[PDB]
Every structure is written in structure tokens, then in C-alpha cells.
Amino acid sequence: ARRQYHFESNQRTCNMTVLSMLPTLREALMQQLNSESLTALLKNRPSNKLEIWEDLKIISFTRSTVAVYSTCMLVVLLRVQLNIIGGYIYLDNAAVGKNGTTILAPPDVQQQYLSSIQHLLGDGLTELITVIKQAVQKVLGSVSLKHSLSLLDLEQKLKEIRNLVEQKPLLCHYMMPDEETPLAVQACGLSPRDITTIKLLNETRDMLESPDFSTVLNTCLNRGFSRLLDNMAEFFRPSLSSVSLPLAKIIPIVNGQIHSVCSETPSHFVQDLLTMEQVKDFAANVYEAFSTP
């Protein structure tokens, strides 16, 4: 119907929102995984530089791996949220014709619903760091700073990290707190009186647990890690030959990737995700579902 028209504007709103939130994601990762402070400790050459390098090994890989997961999560979660609320706004708009109808999603409901995003940027992020840090530790912990990896050996290390992460809890758990949680930690100022918000959060949870969401997120994640690998390729060059670098040389390269992964200047990375046709098709199914009676 007249939906595709409302759907098209709603998509760019979602894009504005991602770009708008990346500084916040980046800043949180960089404060919680502050490698630049460890490199500053090494610049004023200290005694325990070995100890600091083994730290930086973990932090650099954790930061970049979390950067990729959380950025892909931000994109797909916002596509869900914005298309759920958009669909409700559409129906509220269609119900102004009718009489004895009240609006379901007024501005204060929209805003409380959308604030659920704070979990991903907040405690979910922190728990993701914890889980990924544990994986990097397992995979790279006992690997000498002297060990060489080609670009593709590095790719393989990243896959071993991913397999450890994607098989204690489902990924849905970092985007949304568990239902057995006080309502208050799930949206800003959320209480049992916020019936409509609670209902939107239920339907969001349905979406996040559905297999179609699993598919879209997996596709986004594969792309993200591919693109991360592509951004690093030039540093495994010298002129068309590729080299295996020792791990200590790979650390600074991995470390710098957050600036591309979480780039509001839509790095080719984020715009990459925002233009994936798979993501766009998923969004349209979400919107068709929530905008029909």
C-alpha cells in the first residue's frame, strides 16, 4: 500500500541512528580496552615490557573482535527496533481516521522503547568484552610474541576466537538483558506501569530469538570479519607478495582497526553493513509484520 513510502524514510532514520551512536560505542570500547595507555607506558621504556606486551596482545585482539561484533549487533538491533516502532507509528497514523482510538506509541513510549539500546552500549558490551577476552586468552595466550602468522593464519586465529564465542550464551544475550531481570535495567526508567513499552520489548525479544534474525546477524558478522581482514591486508605486504609477520608486529595492526570498524565518517566498513541487501530485506519483513493489523 502506502507503506513502502513510510518504509523508505524509516530506513535512513536507522542509518542516521547507527552513525549517531558509533562515537559512543567507540569511546566505551577504547576506555574499557585502553591499549593506548599501555603503549604510552612502553614509550617511557620500563622494566616489565614483556608483561605489558602480553597484556596488549590480549587487549588489541579483544578490542578489535568486540568492535566487529558490537558494530554488527548495533546495526541489526537498530534495524529491528526502528522497524518495530515504525510499524506501530504507521498503525497509530492509520487509526486517526477511526474514532474512539487512542495512540499506542506516542513520543514518550518511542523514546523509552529505543532507550533499550543502552544495554548493548552498556552492560551487554561489558559482558561481551568479558567473554571475548576469555576467548582471545584461550587462543592467543600461549602464543609467543615471536610466532609468525600470514594474513590467512591470522584469519584462522579470528575464526577460532569466533567459534569459542558463538557456542556460553546466545548472541541475543548481549543485545537484551534476560527477561528474569528487573524491568528497570531493560529500558530507561522502565517500570511495570509501562505496559506498551513492555509489549514492544516482548516482540523485540521474539525477533531477536527468531531464526531469520540469526541469519542476518551471521551474514553481517561474516562480512564484518572479512572487511576487517581486508583492511589489514596492506600491512602484510612490503610488492604483490605477502609475508608472515611475528605476532608482536601484528598487535599494532590489529589495535588500529577500531578506528575503521567504529567509524562515524561512515568508513567503508559501516556503510558496507548499512547497504547490505540481506539486511535491507530483513528490515522490510520486520516492517511488513509490525505495520499490518
Binding site: 612502553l42 615471536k146 599494532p252 588500529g256 565518517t265
Partner: peptide, 26 residues
Amino acid sequence: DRELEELLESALDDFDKAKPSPAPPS
């Protein structure tokens, strides 16, 4: 051991070399 030392001091220079670019039409 001592190959280590020159590797760690060399790697340190690579943090600045790894960051992204700036742009002219802004």
C-alpha cells in the same frame, strides 16, 4: 631473548603507522 628486544622496540613504532587517513573535500 635478544632478537626479542629489537622486535619489541620495532613494533612500538607501528602503532602510529597503523591508524587511518584524513580527507580534503571537508
